[PDB]
Write a protein that binds this ligand. Structure first.
Ligand SMILES: N[C@](CC1c2ccccc2Oc2ccccc21)(C(=O)O)[C@H]1C[C@@H]1C(=O)O
Ligand SMILES: N[C@](CC1c2ccccc2Oc2ccccc21)(C(=O)O)[C@H]1C[C@@H]1C(=O)O
Ligand SMILES: *[C@@H]1O[C@H](CO)[C@@H](O)[C@H](O)[C@H]1NC(C)=O
Ligand SMILES: *[C@@H]1O[C@H](CO)[C@@H](O)[C@H](O)[C@H]1NC(C)=O
Lengths: 761, 743
């Protein structure tokens, strides 16, 4: 059947008046909510356009509406009449189609657009939301009023980011809706920097056991308490039933498949408490309701399918009466949600035609000779796509602009619904905001978004950390990272790498390189070493006594330079200890190093001269001491030329010290001087094995022997002590200073013990 | 309104460009001689042969439904709309043998994919038809255009032409061809130098500019052409004026047409062109030649063709113009077979055979049109039987095995091309086929004439040699240049040269990072013969002086100890020199220390003069020196490091990797102190001992700095051994001249 009206400007149209044939037939029952209501909406829009002065005033608008029967092949056969009656014939009277407003199902729209692209016939759909009609390579002359299927995916991605949800689950379905939209949702989720679990899909013929298994699979991850539903009505209903059976707590962010529908929450109200759904935004037309209610078959002869619709709706046969006064009122009539889109499409086509007419014929408001061969390409590209007008049957003081983007799609406009309970034993859908270009959620009506008990925390898989580097992301899932704490030995040098530097274990939390604090780790020059330095001061007092010895030298009938040399050596070792303790530096370490060796050599030379003089029985003693001093000077010069500067040393990796040593160390050259002193002491003892007994200056000889024995014992005790303390430079200098001060004090005491008795006697 | 509706059991659609596109006030222009009447006559001849054949559809008779395209896409769509009014008097169409134009084929495929009608093209070579997402019911017996991109790009690989310059005409033919050829070249490691674009609206000024841009690039001597016939002809003519010589590698736009060269045969020579292979059909010539507009009443356009090929008016208005009689006929003098005729027949059979096979699957009980075959499922026929045909060419020449008609996964035909080389022979210019490309190269190099005895066009000068000459890229794209590296570091990688050893000196490219320690191991060379001879002489002298002793004695034991120490000093020279250095590096140092202690004891023996107690005390002092050198050894360790920092010139490695001036300085300082004490004691026989001790002291003082300032590769040990043996020899000379005075 065909539906032809007027003919001045014929408008095409395809509607699913009949449902798809069940028992292998062409067409079956009449689609009341999708084939009759939309058909009457288009007819009402055409009538309003005709009885309208500011749109197509002097030109009348016709119609050539057809039935597609929800079949792509049947739709192709019917749409063949659109091209065969306009331009196919030549270069049932044929009618010239100017535009086609039809196509509810995606496949029907695809086939009709494929047919009409070749013949340059523009088409404007009203219910085709398929995402594969957006590309103009395959569908050049296709436009639509409803938004595509990825706009709701973008809306849910923005919703997930708004609520700070990162690790979420995902449920999809088999077919175009469920697979095409899921890829777009994943793409925007990657663009939204959020995580997708990408769980299993639904084949629309899926058993209850398989649904339960998928529910358990979603329950495997406990941190992702959020699931995204790109499922149809039946799949969503089955999933809710399975969740209710298994008693699983979830919040579901759904799409237009769920919407604000109560048929999917029947018997599963407990499982859905914080369900978030998106419904395509639409408003009811009161004028269309008034037009449709006052419709009866007695005068409605324009619609060939009205009799069948009346027979299916009311039990009337028209052969036997069986019916009377069965007026269609508001009690059993409900306006279909996509009727404003049909009116918008018809009015957009009318406005495009009017604009083209005004541009081509600015003189008269009637068809010109240039309007008979209308060009579909120019009309679509310059006029159909460039439309900006207020939505009819809606006050102009509202952001309702029927416009097409660069791909000819509609303007995104959705409503967000939360399946909540107001407090009683009833459940209902409540709008909590809209999405035109950005979210407009209000945190006042959502039950789980209340400040109490938190806003349903469903954040990322892991948590940020400061002391633990983020370098243990799970292989294959970079969304669940492990806060591995790096060892304190390794500091922070990069963004996520804990690496040691050597000059400190943890300077600060700057996380940019390593900082070496300028300090000394062997800075013992304080009251802690107060005891040793004072002992050195005692040696200085002995030096003062040396001056008294000089006075004693003026009136002593009993050689005299040996005592002066011993006093000078004592002063030298005291000065070396003072230099070591007070301030260690590059120029303050070599001086004491040479001084201690010089003092040791002077003492050894004095002992050797004394024992040689004893065994023999001033020029010879002076020559011997000068030769010993020259040898010591050569030794210290060799030490200096071997390594003069001191650059310090680093500590062991087990700890973090400032400076292990003030100058160069770990050298066995001082062991050579120690061995030379030991050999000198051994030679002195070998000589004194028989030379110790000496009547001439017996007290002096005994004191010299005692001093030599004490020095040998002190050196033999200190050498292992020095070796042990070499591992700890903090106290090694103090131990060496104490040892040398004790040796000097012992030598001075041994020298002065018989002198006092001799003076007193 | 003219159309052919030959009835039959199965009706095959037809679609040919009978009428040229009207550029004036008429939709349809003239009558197309070659791509028009001749191709439809070939299809009719193939249909008649199929009907007369007793092996191909013996019972089913094939009908013909032939329309005209008028060389327009809209007209072709309007005509092909008659092919779909059979399932949605009308005639049921099994398939459509239509095409001859890329736009017409595209539009017809777009219309026919909706109604599931198989379509086979005989001349459409557009690459846009190769995708099944937009044309899932389209097949062709001719290869697509981009196949030629693979036909001659391998030629570039055959003659080692890695640097090419591409020139093409904008539109649809050369556009996709450029991308296909660039992809093939990139897959074959061939880089593109220039990429120009020729236009139909351009003039000689812009052509000369393309040539001028081509000339100012001497490396690229080969130009790959993707252009139409007129563009290539005019470009050759323009290059004639510029006196430009190139090696053109052109596509089917040039082919083997004599119109391309025109009067510019001296600039086109050596050109390589590709032509679609097409054997002539002997039976078609006889069928077409014996045709007159009196019995061929099934061809509505045949009268117009008769009035176009020959000036005739016998059909209508005889007196208006020059009427003709039956004297006008068709023969071989003024008729030539169109190149794409064997494809057209190959298309028709490609349907019939498929249908035949389909029957054998659906109607196997009789040789007739069974009812189950009346449905004529287009999808099943296309995806089950149309794409699975392996029949040979019906009219292939004798001994021609390569004549199987096949369709690949995209429905395209088999790519078979012929390579033509423009040559001069004798004094006549003509084309000559030099090979074929049936998915492989079969060029005949022995019969190819080049521009001037050779075609060198490689941009890269030469491959880089190994041994730090491979280098890397200098900042270009095609190949690279070669620069050397300093030979101390081996080129461990293909771009950089990095050191991997102390001395290294890599040997060849293979195993560059060899061990090659380059140690200072020196055998008994010329500089070593002296020290070993001196050591042997000293050993002989010590043996003589200990043999003369003991027997005649009337220091004693001290003298024997001194002689043993002198012998130890003499053998220390040989101990120091050793090519292999083991982990025991203390042998030389302990030997030197023992020699010094022996000298000190020998001096102290004369210093002292209870004497036996001193002879034991000096041994105890030697023991103290031994424990001191042991403590020294407790702080020094050997190794394999090299003490020379000359890198490439560092061909000597230290025997023991340890700081020489760390504690050896202290040991020598102790020795110097001891010997200075002995010298001071002796300064108070004895004179000779003091003199030789002084000579040794200044000798050591002079030889100490030179071992550190010169830092010889291997002579430091030799000089130390020479100094030691000289000191020992002086001591031995004194201790041997003393008995000379004694005797
Ligand atoms: N706009 C729809 C969307 C439709 C759809 C919507 C929700 C769930 C499943 C589902 O099936 C698919 C599959 C692919 C593309 C679109 C859909 C259309 O049919 O195109 C449909 C409302 C329009 C109407 O028929 O009135
Ligand atoms: N096979 C061709 C190839 C054709 C072509 C061949 C050579 C030079 C220019 C050129 O113009 C284009 C442009 C786009 C696509 C195809 C072509 C076809 O029409 O498809 C053409 C021989 C067939 C015929 O028309 O008889
Ligand atoms: C999401 O986190 C941001 C912090 O960047 C915060 O400002 C915002 O309030 C949070 N939104 C919630 C918790 O809904
Ligand atoms: C091309 O190079 C290969 C080796 O690189 C050589 O074998 C072949 O002969 C060359 N072909 C020529 C020079 O035509």
């Amino acid at each position: 059947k065909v539906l032809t009206l007027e003919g001045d400007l014929v408008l095409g149209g395809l509607f699913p008046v009949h449902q798809k044939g069940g028992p292998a037939e062409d067409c079956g029952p009449v689609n009341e909510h999708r084939g009759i209501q939309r058909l009457e909406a288009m007819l009402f829009a055409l009538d309003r356009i005709n009885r309208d002065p500011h749109l197509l005033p002097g030109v009348r608008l016709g119609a050539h509406i057809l039935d597609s029967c929800s079949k792509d092949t049947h739709a192709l056969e019917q749409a063949l009449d659109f091209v065969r009656a306009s331009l196919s014939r030549g270069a049932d009277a044929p009618t010239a189609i100017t535009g086609v407003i039809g196509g509810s199902y995606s496949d029907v729209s695809i086939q009709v657009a494929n047919l009409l692209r070749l013949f340059q016939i523009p088409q404007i759909s009203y219910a085709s939301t398929s995402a594969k009609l957006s590309d103009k390579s395959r569908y050049d002359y296709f436009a639509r009023t409803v938004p595509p299927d990825f706009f709701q995916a973008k809306a849910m991605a923005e919703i997930l980011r708004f609520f700070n949800w990162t690790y979420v689950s995902t449920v999809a379905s088999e077919g175009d809706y469920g697979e095409t939209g899921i890829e777009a949702f994943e793409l925007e989720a990657r663009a939204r920097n959020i995580c997708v679990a990408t769980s299993e899909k639904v084949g629309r013929a899926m058993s209850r056991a398989a649904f339960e298994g998928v529910v358990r699979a979603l329950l495997q991850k406990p941190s992702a308490r959020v699931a995204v539903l790109f499922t149809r009505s039946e799949d969503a209903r089955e999933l809710l039933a399975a969740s209710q059976r298994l008693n699983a707590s979830f919040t579901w962010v759904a799409s237009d498949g769920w919407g604000a529908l109560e048929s999917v929450v029947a018997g599963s109200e407990g499982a859905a408490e914080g369900a978030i759904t998106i419904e395509l935004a639409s408003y009811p037309i009161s004028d269309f309701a008034s037009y449709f209610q006052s419709l009866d078959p007695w005068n409605n002869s324009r619609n060939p399918w009205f009799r069948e619709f009346w027979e299916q709706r009311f039990r009337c046969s028209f052969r036997q009466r069986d019916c009377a006064a069965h007026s269609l009122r508001a009690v059993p009539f409900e306006q279909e949600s996509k009727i404003m889109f049909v009116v918008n499409a018809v009015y957009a086509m009318a406005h495009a035609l009017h604009n083209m007419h005004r541009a081509l014929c600015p003189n008269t408001t009637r068809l010109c000779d240039a309007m008979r061969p209308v060009n579909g390409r120019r009309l679509y590209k310059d006029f159909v796509l460039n439309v900006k007008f207020d939505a009819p049957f809606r006050p102009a003081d509202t952001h309702n602009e029927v416009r097409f983007d660069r791909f000819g799609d509609g303007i995104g406009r959705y409503n967000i619904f939360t399946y909540l309970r107001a407090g009683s034993g009833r459940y209902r859908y409540q709008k909590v905001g809209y999405w035109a270009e950005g979210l407009t959620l209000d945190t006042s009506l959502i039950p789980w978004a209340s400040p109490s008990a938190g806003p349903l925390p469903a954040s990322r898989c892991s948590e940020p950390c400061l002391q633990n580097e983020v370098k243990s992301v799970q292989p294959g899932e970079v969304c669940c990272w492990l806060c591995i704490p790096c060892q304190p030995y390794e500091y922070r040098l990069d963004e996520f790498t804990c690496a040691d530097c050597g000059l400190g274990y943890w300077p600060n939390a700057s996380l940019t390189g390593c900082f070496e604090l300028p300090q000394e780790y062997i800075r013992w020059g304080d009251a802690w070493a107060v005891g040793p330095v004072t002992i050195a001061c005692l040696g200085a007092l002995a030096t003062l006594f040396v001056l008294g010895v000089f006075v004693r030298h003026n009136a002593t009938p009993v050689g005299r330079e040996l005592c002066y040399i011993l006093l000078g050596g004592v002063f030298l070792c005291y000065c070396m200890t003072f230099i070591f303790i007070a301030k260690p530096s590059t120029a303050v370490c070599t001086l004491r190093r040479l001084g201690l060796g010089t003092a040791f050599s002077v003492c050894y030379s004095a002992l050797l001269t004394k024992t040689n003089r004893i065994a023999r029985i001033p020029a010879s003693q002076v020559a011997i001491c000068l030769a010993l001093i020259s040898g010591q000077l050569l030794i210290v010069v060799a030490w200096l030329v071997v390594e003069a500067p001191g650059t310090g040393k680093e500590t062991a990796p087990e700890r973090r010290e400032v400076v292990t040593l003030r100058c160069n160390h770990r050298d066995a050259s001082m062991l050579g001087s120690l061995a030379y002193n030991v050999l000198l002491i051994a030679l002195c003892t070998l000589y004194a094995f028989k030379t110790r007994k000496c009547p001439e200056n017996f007290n002096e000889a005994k004191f010299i022997g005692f001093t030599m024995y004490t020095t040998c014992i002190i050196w033999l005790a200190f050498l292992p002590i020095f070796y042990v303390t070499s591992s700890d430079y903090r106290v090694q200098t103090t131990t060496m200073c104490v040892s040398v001060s004790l040796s000097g004090s012992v030598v001075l005491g041994c020298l002065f013990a018989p002198k006092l008795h001799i003076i007193l006697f | 309104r003219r159309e052919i509706k030959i009835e039959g059991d199965l009706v095959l659609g037809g679609l040919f460009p009978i009428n040229e596109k009207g550029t004036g006030t008429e939709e349809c222009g003239r009558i197309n001689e070659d791509r028009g009447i001749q191709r439809l006559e070939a299809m009719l001849f193939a249909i008649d042969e199929i009907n007369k054949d007793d092996y191909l559809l013996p019972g089913v008779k094939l009908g013909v439904h032939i329309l005209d395209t008028c060389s327009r896409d809209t007209y072709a769509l309007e005509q092909s709309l008659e092919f779909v009014r059979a399932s949605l008097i009308p005639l049921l169409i099994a398939g459509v043998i239509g095409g001859s134009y890329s736009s017409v084929s595209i539009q017809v495929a777009n219309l026919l994919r909706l109604f599931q009608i198989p379509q086979i093209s005989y001349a459409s070579t557009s690459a846009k038809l190769s995708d099944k997402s937009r044309y899932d019911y389209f097949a062709r017996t001719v290869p697509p255009d981009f196949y030629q991109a693979k036909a001659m790009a391998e030629i570039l690989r055959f003659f080692n032409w890695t640097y090419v310059s591409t020139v093409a005409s904008e539109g649809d033919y050369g556009e996709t061809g450029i991308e296909a050829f660039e992809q093939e070249a990139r897959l074959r490691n061939i880089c593109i130098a220039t990429a120009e674009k020729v236009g139909r609206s351009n003039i000689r000024k812009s052509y000369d500019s393309v040539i001028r841009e081509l000339l100012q690039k001497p490396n690229a001597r080969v130009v790959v052409l993707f252009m139409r016939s007129d563009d290539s002809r005019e470009l050759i003519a323009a290059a004639s004026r510029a006196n430009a010589s190139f090696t053109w590698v052109a596509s089917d736009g040039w082919g083997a047409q004599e119109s391309i060269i025109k009067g510019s045969e001296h600039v086109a020579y050596g050109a390589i062109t590709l032509e679609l292979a097409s054997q002539p059909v002997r039976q078609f010539d006889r069928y077409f030649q014996s045709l007159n507009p009196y019995n061929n009443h099934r061809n509505p356009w045949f009268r117009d063709f008769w009035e176009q090929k020959f000036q005739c008016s016998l059909q209508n208005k005889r007196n208006h113009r020059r009427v003709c009689d039956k004297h006008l006929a068709i023969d071989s003098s003024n008729y030539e077979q169109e190149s794409k005729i064997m494809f057209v027949v190959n298309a028709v059979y490609a349907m019939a055979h498929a249908l035949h096979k389909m029957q054998r699957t659906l109607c196997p009980n009789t040789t007739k049109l069974c009812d189950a075959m009346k449905i004529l499922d287009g999808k099943k026929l296309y995806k089950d039987y149309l794409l699975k045909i392996n029949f040979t060419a019906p009219f292939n020449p004798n001994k021609d095995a390569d004549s199987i008609v096949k369709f690949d996964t995209f429905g395209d035909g088999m790519g078979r091309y012929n390579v033509f080389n423009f040559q001069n022979v004798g004094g006549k210019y003509s084309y000559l086929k030099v090979g074929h490309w049936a998915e492989t190269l079969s060029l005949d190099v022995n019969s190819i004439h080049w521009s001037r005895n050779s075609v060198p066009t490689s941009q890269c000068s030469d491959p880089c040699a190994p041994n730090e000459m491979k280098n890397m890229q200098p900042g270009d794209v095609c190949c690279w240049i070669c620069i050397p590296c300093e030979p101390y570091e081996y080129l461990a990688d293909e771009f950089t040269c990095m050191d991997c050893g102390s001395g290294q000196w890599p040997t060849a490219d293979l195993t560059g990072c060899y061990d090659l320690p380059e140690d200072y191991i020196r055998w008994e060379d010329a500089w070593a013969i002296g020290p070993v001879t001196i050591a042997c002489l000293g050993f002989m002298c010590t043996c003589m002086v200990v043999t003369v002793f003991i027997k005649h004695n009337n220091g004693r034991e001290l003298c024997y100890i001194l002689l043993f120490g002198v012998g130890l000093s003499y053998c220390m020279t040989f101990f120091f020199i050793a090519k292999p250095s083991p982990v025991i590096c203390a042998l030389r140092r302990l030997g030197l220390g023992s020699s010094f202690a022996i000298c000190y004891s020998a001096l102290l023996t004369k210093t002292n003069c209870s004497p036996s107690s001193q002879v034991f005390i000096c041994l105890g002092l030697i023991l103290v020196q031994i424990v001191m050198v042991s403590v020294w050894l407790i702080l020094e360790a050997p190794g394999t490091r090299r003490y020379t920092l000359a890198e490439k010139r560092e061909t000597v490695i230290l025997k023991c990797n340890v700081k020489d001036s760390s504690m050896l300085i202290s040991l020598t300082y102790d020795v110097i102190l001891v010997i200075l004490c002995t010298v001071y004691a002796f300064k108070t026989e004895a004179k000779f001992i003091g003199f030789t001790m002084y000579t040794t002291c200044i000798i050591w003082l002079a030889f100490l700095p030179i071992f550190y300032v010169t830092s010889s590769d291997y002579r430091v040990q030799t000089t130390t051994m020479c100094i030691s043996v000289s000191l020992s020899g002086f001591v031995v000379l004194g201790c041997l001249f003393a008995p000379k005075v004694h005797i």
